[PDB]
Amino acid sequence: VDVEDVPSAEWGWSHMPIGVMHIGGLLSAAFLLVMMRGNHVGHVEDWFLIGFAAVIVALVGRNWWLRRRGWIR
Amino acid sequence: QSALLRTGKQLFETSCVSCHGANLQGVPDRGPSLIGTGEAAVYFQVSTGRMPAMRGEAQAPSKPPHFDESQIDALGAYVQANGGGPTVPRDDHGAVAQESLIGGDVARGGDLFRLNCASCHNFTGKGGALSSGKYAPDLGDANPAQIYTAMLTGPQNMPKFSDRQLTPDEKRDIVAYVRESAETPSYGGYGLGGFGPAPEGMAMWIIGMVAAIGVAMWIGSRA
Amino acid sequence: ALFMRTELAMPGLQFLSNEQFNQLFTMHGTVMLLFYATPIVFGFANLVLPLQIGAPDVAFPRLNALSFWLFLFGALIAIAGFITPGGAADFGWTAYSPLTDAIHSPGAGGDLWIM
Amino acid sequence: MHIEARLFEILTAFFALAAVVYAVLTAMFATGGVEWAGTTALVLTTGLTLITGTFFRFVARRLDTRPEDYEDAEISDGAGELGFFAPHSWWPILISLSFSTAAVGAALWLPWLIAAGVAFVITSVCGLVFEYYWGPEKH
Amino acid sequence: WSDALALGWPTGITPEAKLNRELWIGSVIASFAVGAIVWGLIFWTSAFHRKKATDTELPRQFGYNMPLELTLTVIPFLIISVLFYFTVVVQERMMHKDPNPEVVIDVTAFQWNWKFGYQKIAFADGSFDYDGADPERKEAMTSRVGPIRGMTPEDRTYLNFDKIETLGTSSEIPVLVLPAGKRIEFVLNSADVIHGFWVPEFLFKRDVLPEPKANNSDNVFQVSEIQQTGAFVGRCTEMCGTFHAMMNFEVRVVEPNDFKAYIDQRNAGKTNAEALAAINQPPLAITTEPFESRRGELV
Amino acid sequence: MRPEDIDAGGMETVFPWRESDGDGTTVESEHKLTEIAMGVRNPVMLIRIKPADMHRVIKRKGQESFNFGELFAYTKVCSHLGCPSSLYEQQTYRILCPCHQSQFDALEFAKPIFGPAARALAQLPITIDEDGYLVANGDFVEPVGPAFWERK
Amino acid sequence: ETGIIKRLPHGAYVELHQPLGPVDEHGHPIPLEYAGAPLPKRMNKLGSGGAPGTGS
Amino acid sequence: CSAGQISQTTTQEPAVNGVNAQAGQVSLRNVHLRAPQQTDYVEPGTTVELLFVAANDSTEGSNKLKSITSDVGEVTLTGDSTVPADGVLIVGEPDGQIAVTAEVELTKPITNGLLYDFTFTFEDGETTVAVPISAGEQPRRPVPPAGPG
Numbered sequence A: 001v002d003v004e005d006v007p008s009a010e011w012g013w014s015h016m017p018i019g020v021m022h023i024g025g026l027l028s029a030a031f032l033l034v035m036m037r038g039n040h041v042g043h044v045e046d047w048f049l050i051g052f053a054a055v056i057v058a059l060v061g062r063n064w065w066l067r068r069r070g071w072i073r
Numbered sequence B: 001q002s003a004l005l006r007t008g009k010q011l012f013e014t015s016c017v018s019c020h021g022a023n024l025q026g027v028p029d030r031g032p033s034l035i036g037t038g039e040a041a042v043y044f045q046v047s048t049g050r051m052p053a054m055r056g057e058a059q060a061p062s063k064p065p066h067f068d069e070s071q072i073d074a075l076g077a078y079v080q081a082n083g084g085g086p087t088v089p090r091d092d093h094g095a096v097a098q099e100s101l102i103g104g105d106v107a108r109g110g111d112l113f114r115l116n117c118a119s120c121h122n123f124t125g126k127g128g129a130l131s132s133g134k135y136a137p138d139l140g141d142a143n144p145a146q147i148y149t150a151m152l153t154g155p156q157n158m159p160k161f162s163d164r165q166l167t168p169d170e171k172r173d174i175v176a177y178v179r180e181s182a183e184t185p186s187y188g189g190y191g192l193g194g195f196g197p198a199p200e201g202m203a204m205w206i207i208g209m210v211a212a213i214g215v216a217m218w219i220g221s222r223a
Numbered sequence C: 001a002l003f004m005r006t007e008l009a010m011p012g013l014q015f016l017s018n019e020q021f022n023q024l025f026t027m028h029g030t031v032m033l034l035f036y037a038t039p040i041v042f043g044f045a046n047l048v049l050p051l052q053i054g055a056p057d058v059a060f061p062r063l064n065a066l067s068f069w070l071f072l073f074g075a076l077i078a079i080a081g082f083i084t085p086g087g088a089a090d091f092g093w094t095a096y097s098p099l100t101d102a103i104h105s106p107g108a109g110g111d112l113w114i115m
Numbered sequence D: 001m002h003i004e005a006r007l008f009e010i011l012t013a014f015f016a017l018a019a020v021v022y023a024v025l026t027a028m029f030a031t032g033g034v035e036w037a038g039t040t041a042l043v044l045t046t047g048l049t050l051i052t053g054t055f056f057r058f059v060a061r062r063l064d065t066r067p068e069d070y071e072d073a074e075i076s077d078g079a080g081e082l083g084f085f086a087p088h089s090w091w092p093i094l095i096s097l098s099f100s101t102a103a104v105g106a107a108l109w110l111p112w113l114i115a116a117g118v119a120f121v122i123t124s125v126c127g128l129v130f131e132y133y134w135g136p137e138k139h
Numbered sequence E: 001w002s003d004a005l006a007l008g009w010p011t012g013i014t015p016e017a018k019l020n021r022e023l024w025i026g027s028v029i030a031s032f033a034v035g036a037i038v039w040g041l042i043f044w045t046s047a048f049h050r051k052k053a054t055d056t057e058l059p060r061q062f063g064y065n066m067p068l069e070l071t072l073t074v075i076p077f078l079i080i081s082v083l084f085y086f087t088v089v090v091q092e093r094m095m096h097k098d099p100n101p102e103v104v105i106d107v108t109a110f111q112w113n114w115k116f117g118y119q120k121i122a123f124a125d126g127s128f129d130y131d132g133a134d135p136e137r138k139e140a141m142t143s144r145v146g147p148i149r150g151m152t153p154e155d156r157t158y159l160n161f162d163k164i165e166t167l168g169t170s171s172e173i174p175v176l177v178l179p180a181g182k183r184i185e186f187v188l189n190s191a192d193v194i195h196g197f198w199v200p201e202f203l204f205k206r207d208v209l210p211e212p213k214a215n216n217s218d219n220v221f222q223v224s225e226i227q228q229t230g231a232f233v234g235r236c237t238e239m240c241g242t243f244h245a246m247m248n249f250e251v252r253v254v255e256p257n258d259f260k261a262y263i264d265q266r267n268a269g270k271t272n273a274e275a276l277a278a279i280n281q282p283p284l285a286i287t288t289e290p291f292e293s294r295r296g297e298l299v
Numbered sequence F: 001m002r003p004e005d006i007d008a009g010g011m012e013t014v015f016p017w018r019e020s021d022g023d024g025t026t027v028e029s030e031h032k033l034t035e036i037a038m039g040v041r042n043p044v045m046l047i048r049i050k051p052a053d054m055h056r057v058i059k060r061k062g063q064e065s066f067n068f069g070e071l072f073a074y075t076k077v078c079s080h081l082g083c084p085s086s087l088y089e090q091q092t093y094r095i096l097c098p099c100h101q102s103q104f105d106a107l108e109f110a111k112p113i114f115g116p117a118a119r120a121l122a123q124l125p126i127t128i129d130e131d132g133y134l135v136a137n138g139d140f141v142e143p144v145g146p147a148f149w150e151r152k
Numbered sequence G: 001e002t003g004i005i006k007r008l009p010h011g012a013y014v015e016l017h018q019p020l021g022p023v024d025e026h027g028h029p030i031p032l033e034y035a036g037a038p039l040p041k042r043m044n045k046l047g048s049g050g051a052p053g054t055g056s
Numbered sequence H: 001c002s003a004g005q006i007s008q009t010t011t012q013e014p015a016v017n018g019v020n021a022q023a024g025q026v027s028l029r030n031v032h033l034r035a036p037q038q039t040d041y042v043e044p045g046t047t048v049e050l051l052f053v054a055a056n057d058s059t060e061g062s063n064k065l066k067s068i069t070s071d072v073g074e075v076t077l078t079g080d081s082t083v084p085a086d087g088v089l090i091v092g093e094p095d096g097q098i099a100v101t102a103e104v105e106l107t108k109p110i111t112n113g114l115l116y117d118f119t120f121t122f123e124d125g126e127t128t129v130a131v132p133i134s135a136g137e138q139p140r141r142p143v144p145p146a147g148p149g
Ligand SMILES: CCCCCCCCCCCCCCCC(=O)OC[C@H]1O[C@H](O[C@@H]2[C@H](O)[C@@H](O)[C@H](O)[C@@H](O[C@H]3O[C@H](CO)[C@@H](O)[C@H](O)[C@@H]3O)[C@@H]2OP(=O)(O)OC[C@@H](COC(=O)CCCCCCCC[C@H](C)CCCCCCCC)OC(=O)CCCCCCCCCCCCCCC)[C@@H](O)[C@@H](O)[C@@H]1O
Pocket: A041, A042, A043, A044, A045, A047, A048, A050, A051, A052, A054, A055, A058, C015, C016, C017, E298, E299, H001, H004, H005, H006, H007
């Protein structure tokens, strides 16, 4: 990172690669979706899992698209 | 007594019919039949204020009673006349029994409570969570007759304990244990709620560790 | 309000119960009156009133910040009735007595609403 | 600051008249006589405006005209230091979290949580009140 | 047309209701006239004072017209004074109570059904007297030091009990049976929380309170007569809990001789439905039907 | 124990007892009864289903005759990690384990419906003898308690 | 930031600052370099409050 | 989420030993057999008692009970088996009840724990119930003392 983005960039670990966070988000979403497999008989929680996974996938996709298009760095 | 029966019906008609029916048969998806539940069920449900219920959810709560003792007797007599069932124990003067329900063997009562009761109510009747919005409540406010009739009638999701499964002397031992484990002081300081590790770990973090870190800050320096 | 209005589109209870509907108008009125309109008065005042009188600041800046955080956390306390099993307050935003007493509204939603 | 006092005095006149009229009109030809809740509320609303108006009126007759009370004051009349205005603080959110802890404790009737919340409130309010008064650390 | 201007108000079935409806129509016309004036003034300036393409200077900067300011505080004061006068007249007529009603009904609301009792009948022509009070059951409620003036909160003595009573059920809508042409008095008491006694064709409602006297509520109101026979819905109009929407009732208005026959049948041990069938009426409510006790369509 | 000793909606813990185990007056009887009480796969929950709910009972294959009418017997040992899973909700017919919140459907052969448990609770076959006392009608047809590498 | 607001003769509002190092001829501080150490943010923590007065 | 249309409290059944049944327009509540037992069975030739409460859902007309049959024996109805306009008909005096009766003369043995089919026939409605045996408020019978083993 540049010091304009992280002022103490030369004092410590200041950069995490974006691929790590994108892949971690996708894997976390997939893990939310795999907990639909279980013994539970209700589906309220299935909808909560689907919604949280959808929000995560949308955030990852927005970030990836905006980095590709150059709007954020 | 015919007067007691007409007072009970009169009280029942403007408080219980919407959910239980004019003939005590139940209103579907609103409230069950009361035929054969008995005076003991009425005593438990009304003296602890659970009845009349106010809405449908996971569990109907206890709350201040809507009726006094004679009105509770009248309602219980009216329900008893329709199907019979168990009754609330009485004393010589015909009052609801309280002190004579305290059994003499509290060690047997504790062993019985731990086998039959502590799974849902905890080691010392502090309450415990049940499946989905339900819970076995704290036992510290029930009087002896309420404990006795709670075992006798099996309220909401509490198992029903018949007088053949738990004889009256066993029930009296259990009520003695329940009452004495509610009235005994803590011996090692403030009891911290009686749940054990969770409030003890809360007390370490918010009292002991906060004190230790504050003392360290006082002794040490900043920057 | 959209849930209430959808349930009122047709006769019969299509997806709500009575209890949930009562919670819905109670909390819709509570949220719109006390968590949207009343604090947004002070949102507008914070935006422009010091400018309109030619001041650099309000009289008590930390008290101002405290007022905002009290708004936010009080509103969250009242709305959290919906995460209990019984649900939120269902006795109307006006909270008439004795419907609100412990005998007639026993749930924790009503007490969370009050505090 | 005579207009500031006048505003509250005018409100006071209306509130006192309304309180007297309501008490007299409910005592006569109203079921039960005096309606005590509304009468009490009107009397003490009158008291509220009276306290503030009397304070403003006493303050006004002490100090002579301020530049904001002067019809043709110049901007340069107001030159100088205004006072202290706190530049930043994270103590307000701590105070509100503490008070909300005590409130959740009172809602669910958990006396230990109420005790913890009251202790949190006292600590947070001390933190706010002392923030600009703690001296340097001593070693 | 009086129906379009009434805005959905029922025509009414009592003289008091008709007077209230006339006040409603007149007030609606006044408010529509004021609204038309103000809306027209808004539309006029929005249509004809918009910025043109050929104005370079700013408009005339007027900000004070004192005679107009004073003139626009007097006119609304006059309109509200007229409305206040007629309001007072009509509420005095509607709340008026005669010392000799011809039917006295006890209305008992509870969560969440109705009970109607026949307290007293005294026909004005001497053709029907009946004393229905049952004071041998009001005394059975006495609960007794007590938190409130020596009484526990379970005292319930303020409630009224009668020999002929129609009790509502979750499977039977309660039907109150009344004679046409007679002065009816309603005495309202609640068993628990506040309910609402609204018959829309009465064009009137009142709240039904627990312990009204201790709350300084006048729980008694009369209609001078009901001017036509028929069946009229009544609804609860004070939020009372879970089944506030599902505790309706019906008023069946019959001819006086049929009312006498109905009361004789009830005194002979008949229930409400069979006593209604005995006077050639539908036995159940016909404006409303009971709600399904299933909690909804997903059950 | 006799079948009429339990009401519909009741649940009792039962233990495997033999005539030869005795009443615990002698030393040897006392040791035998201590071994009964301390056996980790011993305790059994006996429930009595409400007769109105018997049409909702689903039987497990191989266990269709394990109930004596409306009396059912399951192991009280939780199949997840061995805690006594004994929080018996009579209206929902749900068996709740206090340790890690597994829930078993008593009407559907104690099949898990919530929590970390993947396996049903073992059913004890029960009947009565000539005197009318409840007795076991054989053994469990599967191992009881927590699972292990060697199982099934 | 000392928290003291001042109105200039032309109507500007400025907050008084306490520099942690040398200043300009204009009076603004020379910017200092971060050294990995905490920075004071309250004037009372720099001694501005003084001391009450010796005694019990 | 617990206060929706599927509610846990509102579908709860009575915590009693008898059974509910819908016979057309009649509600049969707390139906059970009284049959004190000594051994594994109650033998044929014993007379046991069938108890219930019949509630008239309708409030306009009346109703009457006919022909209770079963494959455990024969049922004799004694008393006025008519259930009134909006009233009840108590058949038998249950355990704690301080005269329509249903007497069952047994032909095959019965035992506490199992369910037995009975067919109720009203002049409008007729259904089969599967009735249990309920020891009511009777005490626990003594068990012979076990020896030492
Ligand atoms: C808000 C933002 C989104 C858009 C705006 C609004 C969206 C929300 C709209 C949802 C509407 C739901 C219905 C409302 C009414 C209600 O109250 O419910 C009805 C009934 O329902 C249940 O009955 C089912 C039947 O009606 C009964 O017929 C049946 O018998 C019963 O059967 C069960 O039970 C039996 C035993 O009884 C068993 O035999 C049987 O097998 C079974 O188990 C049924 O139950 P069951 O299927 O369990 O649950 C299912 C219920 C239960 O309600 C519910 O919707 C559950 C609640 C869902 C909550 C959604 C969470 C959203 C995620 C977060 C936003 C993520 C974080 C992001 C935040 C910020 C992000 C910014 C950084 O319906 C549904 O899910 C409806 C389906 C659709 C839901 C919507 C999902 C949308 C998300 C997907 C897209 C992602 C977002 C996009 C991102 C870019 C029982 O409960 C009843 O009492 C109850 O009455």
